[PDB]
């Protein structure tokens, strides 16, 4: 099929590409936690929301039982949904700024 249904909206993974720094400091990106990893595979089941601001590398997310993946460049703000089961495939140096948010902002 000529897919007009990408996995960014099929699975509710809202991605903002090329975010401006004023909105970043409005949310509180620099005042967040840290996470660093090289080439690994992290099976993770989400229990709450997560605003990931990737900093250094690249992360390819593969949902459970799927053969198509979604790629996030180093300048994206990704919001992983609740009850999400995926397998994050890392390839190179990776850094991020995350903040798990409950129901509401």
Interacting residue ranges for another protein, rule: CB under 8 A: 1-2, 4-5, 9-12, 33-42, 47-50, 63-67, 69, 81-83, 98-104
Decide whether 66 or 76 has the Cβ nearer to another protein: 66
Q: How far is the CB of 15 from another protein (least distance, A)?
A: 14
Residue 89 tokens read as 């495939």
Q: How far is the CB of 75 from another protein (least distance, A)?
A: 20
Decide whether 31 or 41 has the Cβ nearer to another protein: 41
Q: What are phi and psi of 27, to 5 degrees?
A: -75, -40
- Locate the DSSP E strands across the chain: 14-17, 35-37, 41-45, 50-54, 59-63, 70-72, 76-80, 85-90, 94-99
């Amino acid at each position: 099929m000529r897919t007009e249904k990408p996995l960014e909206e099929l699975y509710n993974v809202r991605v903002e590409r090329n975010v401006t720094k004023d909105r970043l400091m409005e949310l509180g990106v620099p005042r967040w936690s840290m996470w660093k990893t090289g080439k690994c595979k992290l099976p993770w089941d989400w229990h709450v929301d997560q605003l990931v601001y990737i900093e250094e590398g690249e992360v390819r997310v593969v949902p459970e039982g799927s053969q198509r993946f979604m790629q996030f460049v180093a300048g994206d703000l990704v919001r992983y949904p609740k009850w999400f089961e995926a397998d994050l495939y890392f390839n190179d140096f990776y850094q991020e700024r995350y903040s798990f948010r409950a129901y509401g902002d």
